Structures are given as structure tokens and as C-alpha cells.
Design an enzyme around this catalytic site. Structure first.
Site, PDB file in Angstrom:
ATOM      1  N   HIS A 267       0.899  -1.286   0.163  1.00 40.28           N
ATOM      2  CA  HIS A 267      -0.013  -0.077   0.011  1.00 40.28           C
ATOM      3  C   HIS A 267       0.776   1.182  -0.147  1.00 40.28           C
ATOM      4  O   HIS A 267       0.239   2.438  -0.276  1.00 40.28           O
ATOM      5  CB  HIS A 267      -0.974   0.186   1.240  1.00 40.28           C
TER       6      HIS A 267
ATOM      7  N   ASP B 276      -5.425   6.236   2.511  1.00 33.41           N
ATOM      8  CA  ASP B 276      -5.761   4.882   1.771  1.00 33.41           C
ATOM      9  C   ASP B 276      -7.246   4.380   2.538  1.00 33.41           C
ATOM     10  O   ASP B 276      -7.380   4.755   3.623  1.00 33.41           O
ATOM     11  CB  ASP B 276      -4.670   3.773   2.441  1.00 33.41           C
TER      12      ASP B 276
ATOM     13  N   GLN C  56      11.476  -5.997 -11.171  1.00 39.15           N
ATOM     14  CA  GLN C  56      10.252  -6.458 -11.930  1.00 39.15           C
ATOM     15  C   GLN C  56       9.818  -5.764 -12.850  1.00 39.15           C
ATOM     16  O   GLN C  56       9.259  -6.250 -13.941  1.00 39.15           O
ATOM     17  CB  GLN C  56       9.278  -6.734 -10.668  1.00 39.15           C
TER      18      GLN C  56
ATOM     19  N   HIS D 123       0.673 -14.231  -8.156  1.00 37.85           N
ATOM     20  CA  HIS D 123      -0.367 -14.309  -7.093  1.00 37.85           C
ATOM     21  C   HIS D 123      -1.625 -13.360  -7.202  1.00 37.85           C
ATOM     22  O   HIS D 123      -2.522 -13.510  -6.529  1.00 37.85           O
ATOM     23  CB  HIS D 123       0.209 -13.914  -5.640  1.00 37.85           C
TER      24      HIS D 123
ATOM     25  N   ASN E 106      -0.326  -4.323  -7.804  1.00 38.18           N
ATOM     26  CA  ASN E 106       0.686  -3.691  -8.629  1.00 38.18           C
ATOM     27  C   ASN E 106       1.349  -4.794  -9.282  1.00 38.18           C
ATOM     28  O   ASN E 106       1.621  -4.163 -10.627  1.00 38.18           O
ATOM     29  CB  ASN E 106       1.743  -3.188  -7.572  1.00 38.18           C
ATOM     30  N   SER E 107       1.603  -5.950  -9.144  1.00 39.20           N
ATOM     31  CA  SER E 107       2.161  -6.904 -10.066  1.00 39.20           C
ATOM     32  C   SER E 107       1.148  -6.845 -11.572  1.00 39.20           C
ATOM     33  O   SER E 107       1.812  -7.173 -12.489  1.00 39.20           O
ATOM     34  CB  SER E 107       1.908  -8.339  -9.638  1.00 39.20           C
TER      35      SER E 107
ATOM     36  N   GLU F  68       1.442  -4.101 -13.667  1.00 40.77           N
ATOM     37  CA  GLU F  68       2.917  -3.723 -14.492  1.00 40.77           C
ATOM     38  C   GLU F  68       2.507  -4.892 -15.522  1.00 40.77           C
ATOM     39  O   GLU F  68       2.956  -4.708 -16.673  1.00 40.77           O
ATOM     40  CB  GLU F  68       3.994  -4.285 -13.379  1.00 40.77           C
TER      41      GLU F  68
ATOM     42  N   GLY G 252      -6.873 -12.331   0.241  1.00 48.17           N
ATOM     43  CA  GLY G 252      -7.525 -11.147  -0.057  1.00 48.17           C
ATOM     44  C   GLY G 252      -8.285 -10.837  -1.406  1.00 48.17           C
ATOM     45  O   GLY G 252      -8.903 -11.762  -1.657  1.00 48.17           O
ATOM     46  N   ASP G 253      -8.012  -9.996  -2.261  1.00 47.76           N
ATOM     47  CA  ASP G 253      -8.810  -9.834  -3.419  1.00 47.76           C
ATOM     48  C   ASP G 253      -8.220 -10.111  -4.923  1.00 47.76           C
ATOM     49  O   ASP G 253      -8.404 -10.032  -5.595  1.00 47.76           O
ATOM     50  CB  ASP G 253      -9.361  -8.270  -3.672  1.00 47.76           C
ATOM     51  N   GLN G 254      -7.106 -10.980  -4.602  1.00 51.93           N
ATOM     52  CA  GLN G 254      -6.331 -11.939  -5.664  1.00 51.93           C
ATOM     53  C   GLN G 254      -7.362 -12.712  -6.413  1.00 51.93           C
ATOM     54  O   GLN G 254      -7.209 -12.703  -7.723  1.00 51.93           O
ATOM     55  CB  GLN G 254      -5.204 -12.662  -4.940  1.00 51.93           C
TER      56      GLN G 254
HETATM   57  O1  LIG Z   1      -6.346  -5.476  -1.053  1.00 51.59           O
HETATM   58  C1  LIG Z   1      -6.070  -5.910  -0.026  1.00 51.59           C
HETATM   59  C2  LIG Z   1      -4.803  -5.889   0.932  1.00 51.59           C
HETATM   60  O2  LIG Z   1      -4.089  -4.909   0.194  1.00 51.59           O
HETATM   61  C3  LIG Z   1      -4.387  -6.772   2.044  1.00 51.59           C
HETATM   62  C4  LIG Z   1      -3.254  -6.666   2.951  1.00 51.59           C
HETATM   63  C5  LIG Z   1      -2.992  -7.710   3.674  1.00 51.59           C
HETATM   64  C6  LIG Z   1      -2.023  -7.938   4.539  1.00 51.59           C
HETATM   65  C7  LIG Z   1      -1.060  -6.617   4.317  1.00 51.59           C
HETATM   66  O3  LIG Z   1       0.275  -6.900   4.821  1.00 51.59           O
HETATM   67  C8  LIG Z   1      -1.165  -5.888   3.252  1.00 51.59           C
HETATM   68  C9  LIG Z   1      -2.507  -5.651   2.454  1.00 51.59           C
HETATM   69  O4  LIG Z   1      -5.656  -7.814   2.506  1.00 51.59           O
HETATM   70  C10 LIG Z   1      -6.757  -7.701   2.035  1.00 51.59           C
HETATM   71  C11 LIG Z   1      -7.779  -8.351   2.256  1.00 51.59           C
HETATM   72  C12 LIG Z   1      -9.045  -8.537   1.658  1.00 51.59           C
HETATM   73  O5  LIG Z   1     -10.121  -9.582   2.439  1.00 51.59           O
HETATM   74  C13 LIG Z   1      -9.376  -8.023   0.491  1.00 51.59           C
HETATM   75  C14 LIG Z   1      -8.523  -7.037   0.130  1.00 51.59           C
HETATM   76  O6  LIG Z   1      -8.957  -6.427  -1.057  1.00 51.59           O
HETATM   77  C15 LIG Z   1      -7.251  -6.820   0.689  1.00 51.59           C
END
Ligand SMILES: O=c1c(O)c(-c2ccc(O)cc2)oc2cc(O)cc(O)c12
Length: 446
Positions: free
Chosen positions: A17, A114, A328, A343, A347-348, A351, A366-368
């Protein structure tokens, strides 16, 4: 009149972030050198961003608590430090405001934060200043937070591959793609998950929401949907401004190595630095890479070398590089790279698509999962790895599909089309150029 414009900035003070928000602040500070920008982070987040780095005169850095009392040792899980910081509340943020006001001798006129630092909205409301929320995550995931009840109901009752048709523009998203955090109820809930789940109520209170992406790449209906929920939706190009970049020695000789390879022939593999991949998947990745015969560059943490198959690095040394770090940006922009195994961190992905590199996706966290779905089913510039987890046979199949097989031609062609879309998006007439100007005027009008 003395310029008294003073923007306070609150990153979510963790890894991925940090650079995108500094990137935005650098752009704003350059165009408005008469305006003060006060960047408020923790000791660890400030060390991460500002150690090796020169910053313009109108950006000043301040330090607030990380919420970790001296003597405490957090567990090795990626959520604890997030909870501890968020638990410090708006009063910790206001200590940052105090330091900024004392140094600049100027009251704050605007806050950029943020989106995850939701306590900063309370701070903005207390000061009676606009609150501008910054979104450096997968752009499409914004929609989820306005539909939590529908999503939980569908994830609980319907099939795992059922589509989320109730999200305009995002009907390709499925139950199985949803962040687990937003489904957890009870003991499984964390301060972090509760904070994310409040975004549906928090975000409409923002003067503007700034998305770190290319509007031209998001589904137009999704964009319209979000505009209907927010006071203002602005896209600012996520590409690095020159001041963000820190010149770095290619210690492993990645680019020179890539120069010796054929165009679009190399697999670049990197699966992130936030959640540890299951060791069995690390082994699977190595086995598949070796068996595939393709040239590869694998950015892999040092501590994982010991679990790679015995002799794997040695046997593949003549066609592959296993290294702790790569430049990268430069790797993804190298013509020799034919696929990015990822993953799907935001940002990956940014790019990869800006460089026309198709992807093989294994979302972990997370949102991956949202990103992976957009990549495969919307942009069609990649695949989610066959099996949904890395296996030797499945990953070999995905590598062949994208790198060499005629069946992967559509995906390869789409990656080039998306690159051209990005190139035209960052142009002087893209939406983002106008949106950036809009953002600048919000700050100057505050
Ligand atoms: O976008 C996200 C994100 O950046 C992170 C995050 C977790 C640990 C870190 O150290 C830094 C970031 O978690 C998330 C968890 C979600 O359920 C949904 C998201 O969209 C994110």
C-alpha cells in the site's frame, strides 16, 4: 495571500500500500509546489519508503504509533500487525495531524487516506475537511463492499461456481472468487475484516475516491455502478513518476540474461511476499518449471531455497534463474518474458497488463481471487492455473498453453490489445489526465 493549503496523508502503513500512495503524493506535490503535503506513517512504514529516497521540499514525513507496545512480539500471520495498527484509532492519527500542524504552522485543509484507514474519515469530519479515499487494490473489488449481504447469502446457499450477476458489469465473478475475509462471522472476524466490511458505508462519505488504475480497463457498467454510489470517482494512472524510482543494481544480471533469450519465451514467476505458499506448491512449481523445459526467472525468498527439490536449481541452471530479487518493472517490460506466473497482487497485475504480458494465476489471499477472475474471464489475458493450486502436471499445461500452443493465441493477442489500451489511457487525453486535474482542484479549493 499566503498559500495555506495543507494535505495530510495516511497510508495503510504496510508493504504494497505504500509505494502507490507515495507515487500519487509525489505527483500532487510536483504540480502544486506551494501546497504542503504531510505524509503520516509508522516508524516501520516510513523506514520502508523514505530510507534511500530524496523527497521534494513540500513533502514532510511524520511518525505515529504502530500499535505494537514495546515487548510485544506479533505472531507470524499477516493480519495481526494490521489489527494492531487499526486498533490505535483516530487519536493516534490525530497525533500525526498535530505534528504536521506544528511543523507547517498550517491547519490541515484536506485529507487523503488509503481507504482501509477508515478512522481517518472521523479525523477529517472532526476537522471539517474533505476526505479523499485512495484505492490501490483490485479496482473491481470496490463493488463487493456495497453488496455484502447478497454476497454472504449467495456464498452460503449457492454453488461455488455460481456467478455474482447482481454486481453490474461483474457477472463473471463467482462465489469462489470472494475474499474469505468478507464472509467470516464470529470468532473468525478480525478488526481488519470488520474495517473492510464497513467500506460500503464509509466510502460514500468521501469527497472523492481515487482509484490507482486505468478506467479504460474496468467494465464500463462497473464504473457507472460505482459512480452511482460515490460523490466522485477519479482514476489516476498508477504508473510510477520518475521521483518514485530508486536506481538499482541488477545484482543477478536478470536483464542481461533475458537479452540472451527469444522474444516472449521466458516464464517470470513470483508469488508474492505476504502469505507463505504451501511448501508442497513451491515443490510443484519447481517440478513443473524443470519438466516444462522453458526458460524461467523465479523470484523466490531465500528461506524457501531449502525446500526446493534436491538438485533442481543446479540441473536448471543453464536455462533458469532462481533469485531472491528482480527489478520487476524492468523484467515485465522485457520482450523476452512470455508469461507472468503470479499471485495477482494489484501492482504486479498493473505492471503485467501495462507491458502486454499474459498471466498464469494462483490467487492466495484477499482480493487476488477477484483479480484472477478478471484476468481470465473479463480481460482474457491469462488463465487461473489448472487445478486452482499449483501442481506439476497442471502448471506444465498452463505454461504450454500460454507460451507455445496455438490454443493460447487468443490470450497472447488480447495481452497486446490491452497493452495498447493502457498506452492510450496514460496518454494526455486519457480519462486519468482529466481526473488528475479534478483531484488537484479539489485540493486547491479546500
Ligand atoms: O487489498 C487488500 C490488501 O492489500 C490486504 C493486505 C493484507 C496484508 C498486508 O500486509 C497488506 C495488505 O488484504 C486484503 C484483504 C481482503 O479481504 C481484501 C483485500 O482487497 C485486501
Amino acid at each position: 495571500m499566503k498559500n495555506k493549503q495543507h494535505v495530510a496523508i495516511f497510508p495503510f502503513p504496510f508493504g504494497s500500500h505504500l509505494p502507490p500512495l507515495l507515487n500519487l503524493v509525489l505527483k500532487l506535490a510536483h504540480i502544486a509546489p506551494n501546497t504542503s503535503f504531510s505524509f503520516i506513517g509508522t516508524h516501520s512504514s516510513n523506514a520502508f519508503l523514505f530510507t534511500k529516497r530524496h523527497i521534494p521540499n513540500n513533502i514532510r514525513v511524520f511518525t505515529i504509533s504502530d500499535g505494537i507496545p514495546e515487548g510485544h512480539v506479533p505472531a507470524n500471520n499477516p493480519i495481526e500487525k494490521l489489527d494492531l495498527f487499526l486498533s490505535t484509532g483516530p487519536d493516534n492519527l490525530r497525533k500525526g495531524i498535530e505534528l504536521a500542524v506544528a511543523e507547517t504552522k498550517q491547519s490541515v485543509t484536506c485529507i487523503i487516506a488509503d481507504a482501509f484507514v477508515t478512522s481517518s474519515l472521523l479525523v477529517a469530519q472532526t476537522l471539517n475537511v474533505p476526505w479523499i479515499a485512495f484505492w490501490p487494490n483490485v479496482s473491481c473489488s470496490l463493488s463487493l463492499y456495497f453488496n455484502i449481504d447478497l454476497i454472504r447469502d449467495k456464498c452460503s446457499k449457492d454453488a461455488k461456481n455460481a456467478t455474482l450477476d447482481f454486481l453490474p458489469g461483474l457477472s463473471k465473478l463467482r462465489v469462489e472468487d470472494v475474499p474469505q475475509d468478507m464472509l467470516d462471522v464470529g470468532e473468525k472476524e478480525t478488526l481488519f475484516s470488520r474495517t473492510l466490511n464497513s467500506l460500503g458505508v464509509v466510502l460514500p462519505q468521501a469527497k472523492a475516491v481515487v482509484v490507482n488504475f486505468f478506467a479504460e480497463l474496468d467494465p464500463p457498467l462497473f464504473v457507472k455502478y460505482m459512480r452511482s454510489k460515490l460523490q466522485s470517482l477519479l482514476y489516476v494512472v498508477p504508473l510510477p513518476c520518475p521521483q518514485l524510482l530508486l536506481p538499482e543494481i541488477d545484482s543477478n544480471g536478470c536483464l542481461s540474461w533475458l537479452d540472451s533469450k527469444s522474444s516472449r519465451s521466458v516464464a517470470y514467476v513470483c508469488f508474492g511476499t505476504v502469505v507463505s505458499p504451501p511448501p508442497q506448491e513451491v515443490v510443484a512449481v519447481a517440478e513443473a518449471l524443470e519438466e516444462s523445459g522453458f526458460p524461467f526467472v523465479w523470484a523466490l525468498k531465500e528461506s524457501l531455497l531449502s525446500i526446493l527439490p534436491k538438485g533442481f536449481v543446479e540441473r536448471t541452471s543453464t536455462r533458469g534463474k532462481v533469485v531472491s530479487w528482480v527489478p520487476q518493472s524492468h523484467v515485465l517490460s522485457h520482450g523476452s518474458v512470455g508469461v507472468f506466473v503470479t499471485h495477482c497482487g494489484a501492482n504486479s497485475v498493473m505492471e503485467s497488463v501495462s507491458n502486454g504480458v499474459p498471466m498464469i494465476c494462483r490467487p492466495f489471499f484477499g482480493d487476488q481471487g477477484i483479480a484472477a477472475r478478471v484476468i481470465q474471464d473479463i480481460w482474457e489475458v491469462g488463465v487461473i492455473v489448472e487445478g486452482k493450486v499449483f501442481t506439476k502436471n497442471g502448471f506444465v499445461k498452463s505454461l504450454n498453453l500460454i507460451l507455445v500452443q496455438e490454443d493460447g493465441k487468443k490470450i497472447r493477442d488480447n495481452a497486446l490489445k490491452v497493452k495498447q489500451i493502457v498506452q492510450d489511457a496514460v496518454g494526455p487525453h486519457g480519462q486519468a489526465a482529466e481526473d488528475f486535474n479534478t483531484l488537484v482542484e479539489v485540493i486547491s479549493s479546500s
